[PDB]
């Protein structure tokens, strides 16, 4: 069904920044549309006052995955939301394993 409640939609950079800063919880992430690359999502986690943005796009093979630095190995998935459950692995996902979702609906 692809249920993405963490996708508030399209918001400016200033919006995503204050959005994660409001929660005041390290590890808080959100799903916002890329204001530079259409059809591509962006998962941001607030850490050290700096909002770390990560581009998430589906490969031509149909597998879901995120961008990887030149020299790092990235695993492939079969769902957009599945990326969250797989990224919840400490020292095996991102700067911080997603923990507190910041959706625009209910607190």
């Amino acid at each position: 069904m692809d249920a993405v409640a963490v996708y508030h939609g399209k918001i400016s950079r200033e919006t995503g920044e204050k959005l994660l800063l409001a929660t005041g919880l390290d590890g808080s992430y959100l799903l916002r549309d890329s204001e530079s690359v259409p059809g591509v999502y962006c998962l941001c986690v607030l850490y050290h006052g700096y909002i770390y943005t990560y581009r998430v796009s589906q490969t031509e093979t149909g597998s879901w995955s995120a961008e990887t630095a030149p020299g790092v190995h990235k695993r492939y998935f079969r769902k957009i939301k599945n990326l969250i459950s797989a990224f919840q692995k400490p020292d095996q996902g991102i700067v911080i394993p997603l923990q507190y979702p910041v959706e625009k609906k209910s607190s």
């Binding site: 950079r13 920044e17 800063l21 941001c44 006052g49 700096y50 909002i51 770390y52 943005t53 990560y54 581009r55 995120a66 961008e67 990887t68 630095a69 790092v72 990235k74 020292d91 095996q92 996902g93 991102i94 700067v95």
Partner: peptide
Amino acid sequence: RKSLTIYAQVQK
């Protein structure tokens, strides 16, 4: 300062 975004990539 005046910039709360890194736009980095996954280092893991």
